[PDB]
């Protein structure tokens, strides 16, 4: 929204810049004017051939006589016109170069200054300004916005003025050569442009807004894949696949509808363009027959005007570029124009000599820029004598730290004054104040250079001797000298990560080189290991003795030797004095003391589309006919102007133009049938395979096992994304693009055949020119990307030293040396700057060359078309045909290059989509193999089981686990902690096969058993049961698949689960929807429903996994009642955490490190004394404690 | 994709 | 007469 | 858009 004044934005352009912009915009306007003048001559050439064209055919008597005057007229005329064209070429060359070069130069020269000034501004801000802003946003703002400004003030302006120049220049010629056709052209204007826009808009449909259509299926997919273990457990995979397929079924229908409508739209647009395009020309002819206009003039005005009209549409985008650039320049200049109260880049105020260091804080009220919400310091009085060392203590609020914060004048206080020596702190120069004051912080920071350099950030002028004495006086010499590279070692976030105390010592050394008169030490001893603490403490103590010092920490080991200790309460100073006195005071201090004591060949994806042998041949045959229909447009326009130029006796002309203008439209209407076809056939072909692909992908995704779904690589979102994109992507490749390419090769093919057979060597010449300018056009874009990438790599390095500077800023301001970072920034920038100079030199040549080549190519066109070809019997009407045909073909070929990146992306996206189908699991639920035993009664034998999770094969969960549980009895399972208790339930369901050991049910190994049938006999119940969105009866009936469950059955189950109270209470009753789409319920109801699901299956094996985990009060009671009523008639395994509710169990089994430790009935484990007794004692101790 | 610019 | 506008 | 580069 917020923009910037036009003159402000260019404030850094002066002298040569303004000149460059002037000469540039001049040259640009000329370059603009250049083109419509070319089309002006094109009419004069037509008139030359027209005059001879009429006279040549008017004879029918003498022949040799026509070999004289005609050829002479063509000689002088064609020579003149060719000379002029050659004239225009050099012009456009020069002006193009001037234009792009100059504008780019101005851009560079300005942007450089912008960057420098801006970074300076950033660095010049006061801390309060940072405390209220996001640094990341600010750095990204720098690097991103300056680029926008660059894109703004760049060569885009030149293009804008050039476009405006073609616009005016076009319309001027258009009008002056004739007023009628221009108005007639303007009459049809409010349709054609809109249509073209519409088409361009419709063909942008591949980007992902299809989410609106897919989201319905995407929701199913998401809730499924998010609930994968439940659908796996209950084996409802066929159902989920079915649902997904149905949603896809809808999606494809909506798709084909959209296809139909869009194709109709595009076709209609094309028809309107055709119709108006022809109509204008028919009116043209209608004006030529009246001899009001010359045939060539018609062309001149037509083309000049249409050029001029297109110029606007082509101009518009550069407006947005400059427009965005002001907006970006607003927030940038806002920092640069901003002047702080503190500065620190100012040379002003006193720089006192012989500072004795007598500090006093007088009546200081302060609050950080959270402002009125909190006032931390309510008044204050503190004095510290010269040479002394004062220690500040406090319980909380860190009001202690505030004084250190203020003593550097990072903030000016609300009311009151901080006074170093006798003078107010605000009178003395900031930098000098920062220089006389040394600082050591809790978290020390090191910038990424050598140790010497980090010690050199204390003072720019220093020698390794002073460094040595500095670190040695900080006793850091040893530890660093042992380190390799000596002083030349590295430090920072990347590389050479060191002990905190060492870094702190380097920080103290750095601070020591500063040789300050005032020392501030805030918690530097705190947040550090006890051993090295003393090592650094020695340094800190050695860092004093020549200075006055204020120290703050939580370590009362370092306070005793202080001359004065000071206690705060609610920002109010209270206790001051020596230790013994403060202990005699028995105040806050004493209190605290006592308290602290990619590309490859994938045909099979096309082989999958081979399901439709038809629908493709139709579209290709149709699109090839369209391809053959395309140049027919050019053949007509050739003979329209051709016969009219080759007319001779006029009487026959007016009748033929009507026959053509008719036909001219006839290829139009027939273009509606063909375009809609190839678009509809390919479209419908796209939406079907999208069903087949997404169906074959999703299906095979339900095939995979829990091992694959626990992978960090594959999460629900990632899977849905991978599911959507690939299928969405292959469609674009197999879709429109192909049809268009075939249409285009067909186009150029028919065009070139016609052109080739008509013009001998006329075509052969052009075919030598066109590919050279095309390739010359591609190579330019390659250099553009190269220079772009290289430039990105250079400013990345300068932006890296900016991020380092503005992130750790609060430290750099304390050490000053911002000017250092200024200089480093500048030097970092200087390389891109010289690079940007070369950029303009190149951007110009490549542009002017491609332009000049196109204009010179046009000179060869008519020069060879005339002269050598026209001196022969070969005629103009064919020349006009060949040019159209050939360059049409080429400009159609352009789309080939334009449509190249689609397949590349599709391949990568098609590379994944075939692999995901062919991947096979260790355990597949789809295999119909497996025993399917006939005997009901279930036991469970765990024997010598060892299990490590495939995601984490480090710490093993099970090691030689062995359990046995007879039928119709409850197996309680207690454990210290972890999934060791649950892994049982997981393995029984066979989500995994254990590493070693085995597990049986009826005596048969589950491993050789059927997976589905195995899981079919299990009544799993988890902690937080997931219910899908549908009738609660459909959620309950989910317990049993391959058969629809009865109402009275789900009633019986609901009656068993004791949920009926809710179910008979609701308005919808059993048809009520649950799962947050339609209704909300608490955990109790959900769980009871899970119980219903469990026992409608009528399992022989119930598995209750911490069912009462998330629950409270009576809910636990009723749910436990239900769960209790659920078991006792079945084999079951209960791992619940309420041991009070396990007191009734046939067999309790304490697990330990994967081995069963204690096992037996309650009273036996209670007769024993060990883990279980402790487990039961501790938690019973809590219930007794709550009284 | 005929003259003026689609 | 090609496609840009001659 | 089939296998080499469209």
PDB file of C-alpha atoms in Angstrom, chain A residues 508-655:
ATOM      1  CA  UNK A 508      37.149 -11.077  29.012  1.00  0.00           C
ATOM      2  CA  UNK A 509      40.422 -10.838  27.083  1.00  0.00           C
ATOM      3  CA  UNK A 510      38.610  -8.936  24.341  1.00  0.00           C
ATOM      4  CA  UNK A 511      37.091  -6.696  27.000  1.00  0.00           C
ATOM      5  CA  UNK A 512      40.513  -6.430  28.637  1.00  0.00           C
ATOM      6  CA  UNK A 513      42.202  -5.108  25.479  1.00  0.00           C
ATOM      7  CA  UNK A 514      39.635  -2.294  25.673  1.00  0.00           C
ATOM      8  CA  UNK A 515      41.557  -1.112  28.781  1.00  0.00           C
ATOM      9  CA  UNK A 516      38.359   0.417  30.201  1.00  0.00           C
ATOM     10  CA  UNK A 517      38.051   2.554  33.341  1.00  0.00           C
ATOM     11  CA  UNK A 518      34.625   1.078  34.110  1.00  0.00           C
ATOM     12  CA  UNK A 519      33.865  -2.658  34.192  1.00  0.00           C
ATOM     13  CA  UNK A 520      30.397  -4.219  34.096  1.00  0.00           C
ATOM     14  CA  UNK A 521      30.047  -7.934  34.864  1.00  0.00           C
ATOM     15  CA  UNK A 522      26.560  -9.439  34.592  1.00  0.00           C
ATOM     16  CA  UNK A 523      26.170 -13.118  35.488  1.00  0.00           C
ATOM     17  CA  UNK A 524      29.295 -13.997  33.482  1.00  0.00           C
ATOM     18  CA  UNK A 525      30.142 -16.515  36.210  1.00  0.00           C
ATOM     19  CA  UNK A 526      26.588 -17.879  36.158  1.00  0.00           C
ATOM     20  CA  UNK A 527      25.366 -20.462  33.641  1.00  0.00           C
ATOM     21  CA  UNK A 528      28.741 -22.216  33.625  1.00  0.00           C
ATOM     22  CA  UNK A 529      30.380 -25.370  35.002  1.00  0.00           C
ATOM     23  CA  UNK A 530      31.671 -25.207  38.575  1.00  0.00           C
ATOM     24  CA  UNK A 531      35.233 -26.255  37.723  1.00  0.00           C
ATOM     25  CA  UNK A 532      35.941 -23.726  34.963  1.00  0.00           C
ATOM     26  CA  UNK A 533      33.928 -21.146  36.907  1.00  0.00           C
ATOM     27  CA  UNK A 534      36.884 -20.666  39.250  1.00  0.00           C
ATOM     28  CA  UNK A 535      39.238 -20.513  36.264  1.00  0.00           C
ATOM     29  CA  UNK A 536      37.198 -17.681  34.744  1.00  0.00           C
ATOM     30  CA  UNK A 537      36.670 -16.223  38.227  1.00  0.00           C
ATOM     31  CA  UNK A 538      40.427 -15.805  38.588  1.00  0.00           C
ATOM     32  CA  UNK A 539      40.401 -13.879  35.312  1.00  0.00           C
ATOM     33  CA  UNK A 540      37.422 -11.723  36.335  1.00  0.00           C
ATOM     34  CA  UNK A 541      39.192 -10.846  39.575  1.00  0.00           C
ATOM     35  CA  UNK A 542      42.380 -10.149  37.618  1.00  0.00           C
ATOM     36  CA  UNK A 543      40.281  -8.066  35.209  1.00  0.00           C
ATOM     37  CA  UNK A 544      39.525  -5.679  38.075  1.00  0.00           C
ATOM     38  CA  UNK A 545      42.174  -4.027  40.315  1.00  0.00           C
ATOM     39  CA  UNK A 546      42.683  -1.186  37.806  1.00  0.00           C
ATOM     40  CA  UNK A 547      39.033  -0.230  37.485  1.00  0.00           C
ATOM     41  CA  UNK A 548      35.786   0.628  39.258  1.00  0.00           C
ATOM     42  CA  UNK A 549      33.283  -2.226  38.879  1.00  0.00           C
ATOM     43  CA  UNK A 550      29.592  -3.074  39.191  1.00  0.00           C
ATOM     44  CA  UNK A 551      28.947  -6.824  39.280  1.00  0.00           C
ATOM     45  CA  UNK A 552      25.775  -8.891  39.209  1.00  0.00           C
ATOM     46  CA  UNK A 553      25.295 -12.633  39.603  1.00  0.00           C
ATOM     47  CA  UNK A 554      23.507 -15.392  41.517  1.00  0.00           C
ATOM     48  CA  UNK A 555      26.846 -16.656  42.850  1.00  0.00           C
ATOM     49  CA  UNK A 556      27.319 -15.488  46.437  1.00  0.00           C
ATOM     50  CA  UNK A 557      30.783 -17.073  46.349  1.00  0.00           C
ATOM     51  CA  UNK A 558      32.012 -14.072  44.355  1.00  0.00           C
ATOM     52  CA  UNK A 559      30.188 -11.405  46.367  1.00  0.00           C
ATOM     53  CA  UNK A 560      31.929 -11.620  49.755  1.00  0.00           C
ATOM     54  CA  UNK A 561      35.074  -9.776  48.663  1.00  0.00           C
ATOM     55  CA  UNK A 562      33.002  -6.901  47.278  1.00  0.00           C
ATOM     56  CA  UNK A 563      33.389  -3.550  49.027  1.00  0.00           C
ATOM     57  CA  UNK A 564      29.633  -2.964  48.921  1.00  0.00           C
ATOM     58  CA  UNK A 565      26.641  -5.252  48.352  1.00  0.00           C
ATOM     59  CA  UNK A 566      23.249  -3.880  47.272  1.00  0.00           C
ATOM     60  CA  UNK A 567      19.784  -5.451  47.502  1.00  0.00           C
ATOM     61  CA  UNK A 568      16.678  -4.516  45.510  1.00  0.00           C
ATOM     62  CA  UNK A 569      12.993  -5.165  46.166  1.00  0.00           C
ATOM     63  CA  UNK A 570      10.327  -4.312  43.602  1.00  0.00           C
ATOM     64  CA  UNK A 571      12.828  -2.048  41.879  1.00  0.00           C
ATOM     65  CA  UNK A 572      13.485  -0.328  45.206  1.00  0.00           C
ATOM     66  CA  UNK A 573      17.046  -0.314  46.550  1.00  0.00           C
ATOM     67  CA  UNK A 574      17.044  -1.214  50.254  1.00  0.00           C
ATOM     68  CA  UNK A 575      20.039  -2.935  51.831  1.00  0.00           C
ATOM     69  CA  UNK A 576      23.566  -1.609  51.283  1.00  0.00           C
ATOM     70  CA  UNK A 577      26.808  -2.309  53.147  1.00  0.00           C
ATOM     71  CA  UNK A 578      29.510  -4.871  53.876  1.00  0.00           C
ATOM     72  CA  UNK A 579      28.691  -8.581  54.179  1.00  0.00           C
ATOM     73  CA  UNK A 580      28.793  -8.877  57.985  1.00  0.00           C
ATOM     74  CA  UNK A 581      26.530  -5.832  58.214  1.00  0.00           C
ATOM     75  CA  UNK A 582      24.047  -7.335  55.755  1.00  0.00           C
ATOM     76  CA  UNK A 583      24.137 -10.578  57.737  1.00  0.00           C
ATOM     77  CA  UNK A 584      23.586  -8.582  60.935  1.00  0.00           C
ATOM     78  CA  UNK A 585      20.709  -6.855  59.143  1.00  0.00           C
ATOM     79  CA  UNK A 586      19.220 -10.313  58.560  1.00  0.00           C
ATOM     80  CA  UNK A 587      17.387  -8.864  55.566  1.00  0.00           C
ATOM     81  CA  UNK A 588      16.853 -10.009  51.981  1.00  0.00           C
ATOM     82  CA  UNK A 589      20.549 -10.809  51.472  1.00  0.00           C
ATOM     83  CA  UNK A 590      20.701 -13.046  54.547  1.00  0.00           C
ATOM     84  CA  UNK A 591      17.449 -14.613  53.353  1.00  0.00           C
ATOM     85  CA  UNK A 592      18.904 -15.500  49.947  1.00  0.00           C
ATOM     86  CA  UNK A 593      22.133 -16.696  51.588  1.00  0.00           C
ATOM     87  CA  UNK A 594      20.138 -19.055  53.803  1.00  0.00           C
ATOM     88  CA  UNK A 595      17.912 -20.014  50.865  1.00  0.00           C
ATOM     89  CA  UNK A 596      20.913 -20.951  48.710  1.00  0.00           C
ATOM     90  CA  UNK A 597      22.892 -22.369  51.653  1.00  0.00           C
ATOM     91  CA  UNK A 598      16.673 -37.109 -12.552  1.00  0.00           C
ATOM     92  CA  UNK A 599      15.490 -37.497 -16.163  1.00  0.00           C
ATOM     93  CA  UNK A 600      15.163 -41.043 -17.505  1.00  0.00           C
ATOM     94  CA  UNK A 601      12.856 -42.951 -19.860  1.00  0.00           C
ATOM     95  CA  UNK A 602       9.564 -43.852 -18.184  1.00  0.00           C
ATOM     96  CA  UNK A 603       7.264 -45.270 -20.855  1.00  0.00           C
ATOM     97  CA  UNK A 604       5.270 -47.466 -18.479  1.00  0.00           C
ATOM     98  CA  UNK A 605       3.496 -44.357 -17.206  1.00  0.00           C
ATOM     99  CA  UNK A 606       2.322 -43.899 -20.798  1.00  0.00           C
ATOM    100  CA  UNK A 607       1.667 -47.643 -21.005  1.00  0.00           C
ATOM    101  CA  UNK A 608      -0.787 -47.038 -18.158  1.00  0.00           C
ATOM    102  CA  UNK A 609      -2.550 -44.410 -20.253  1.00  0.00           C
ATOM    103  CA  UNK A 610      -2.552 -47.046 -23.009  1.00  0.00           C
ATOM    104  CA  UNK A 611      -5.749 -48.213 -21.287  1.00  0.00           C
ATOM    105  CA  UNK A 612      -7.229 -45.711 -23.740  1.00  0.00           C
ATOM    106  CA  UNK A 613      -6.081 -46.631 -27.234  1.00  0.00           C
ATOM    107  CA  UNK A 614      -8.754 -44.168 -28.402  1.00  0.00           C
ATOM    108  CA  UNK A 615      -9.181 -40.540 -27.213  1.00  0.00           C
ATOM    109  CA  UNK A 616      -5.558 -39.938 -28.288  1.00  0.00           C
ATOM    110  CA  UNK A 617      -5.642 -40.715 -32.003  1.00  0.00           C
ATOM    111  CA  UNK A 618      -8.711 -38.479 -32.131  1.00  0.00           C
ATOM    112  CA  UNK A 619      -6.958 -35.539 -30.491  1.00  0.00           C
ATOM    113  CA  UNK A 620      -3.746 -35.980 -32.492  1.00  0.00           C
ATOM    114  CA  UNK A 621      -5.471 -36.469 -35.859  1.00  0.00           C
ATOM    115  CA  UNK A 622      -7.661 -33.504 -34.993  1.00  0.00           C
ATOM    116  CA  UNK A 623      -4.696 -31.440 -33.770  1.00  0.00           C
ATOM    117  CA  UNK A 624      -2.730 -32.383 -36.889  1.00  0.00           C
ATOM    118  CA  UNK A 625      -5.651 -31.223 -39.011  1.00  0.00           C
ATOM    119  CA  UNK A 626      -5.554 -28.065 -36.891  1.00  0.00           C
ATOM    120  CA  UNK A 627      -1.824 -28.011 -37.541  1.00  0.00           C
ATOM    121  CA  UNK A 628      -2.690 -28.225 -41.226  1.00  0.00           C
ATOM    122  CA  UNK A 629      -5.490 -25.712 -40.740  1.00  0.00           C
ATOM    123  CA  UNK A 630      -3.161 -23.161 -39.141  1.00  0.00           C
ATOM    124  CA  UNK A 631      -1.063 -22.109 -42.170  1.00  0.00           C
ATOM    125  CA  UNK A 632      -4.152 -22.163 -44.396  1.00  0.00           C
ATOM    126  CA  UNK A 633      -4.815 -18.863 -42.656  1.00  0.00           C
ATOM    127  CA  UNK A 634      -1.486 -17.664 -44.037  1.00  0.00           C
ATOM    128  CA  UNK A 635      -2.149 -19.041 -47.519  1.00  0.00           C
ATOM    129  CA  UNK A 636      -5.364 -17.017 -47.709  1.00  0.00           C
ATOM    130  CA  UNK A 637      -3.906 -13.712 -46.504  1.00  0.00           C
ATOM    131  CA  UNK A 638      -1.212 -14.319 -49.105  1.00  0.00           C
ATOM    132  CA  UNK A 639      -3.751 -14.643 -51.920  1.00  0.00           C
ATOM    133  CA  UNK A 640      -6.064 -11.956 -50.508  1.00  0.00           C
ATOM    134  CA  UNK A 641      -3.320  -9.360 -50.852  1.00  0.00           C
ATOM    135  CA  UNK A 642      -1.884 -11.589 -53.576  1.00  0.00           C
ATOM    136  CA  UNK A 643      -4.768 -11.635 -56.039  1.00  0.00           C
ATOM    137  CA  UNK A 644      -5.466  -7.990 -55.209  1.00  0.00           C
ATOM    138  CA  UNK A 645      -1.820  -7.253 -56.016  1.00  0.00           C
ATOM    139  CA  UNK A 646      -1.886  -9.726 -58.911  1.00  0.00           C
ATOM    140  CA  UNK A 647      -5.330  -8.516 -59.970  1.00  0.00           C
ATOM    141  CA  UNK A 648      -4.767  -6.884 -63.339  1.00  0.00           C
ATOM    142  CA  UNK A 649      -8.261  -6.062 -64.607  1.00  0.00           C
ATOM    143  CA  UNK A 650     -10.139  -4.761 -61.516  1.00  0.00           C
ATOM    144  CA  UNK A 651     -13.647  -5.997 -62.418  1.00  0.00           C
ATOM    145  CA  UNK A 652     -12.881  -9.531 -61.215  1.00  0.00           C
ATOM    146  CA  UNK A 653     -11.269  -8.396 -57.953  1.00  0.00           C
ATOM    147  CA  UNK A 654     -14.134  -7.204 -55.736  1.00  0.00           C
ATOM    148  CA  UNK A 655     -15.877 -10.540 -56.335  1.00  0.00           C
TER     149      UNK A 655
END
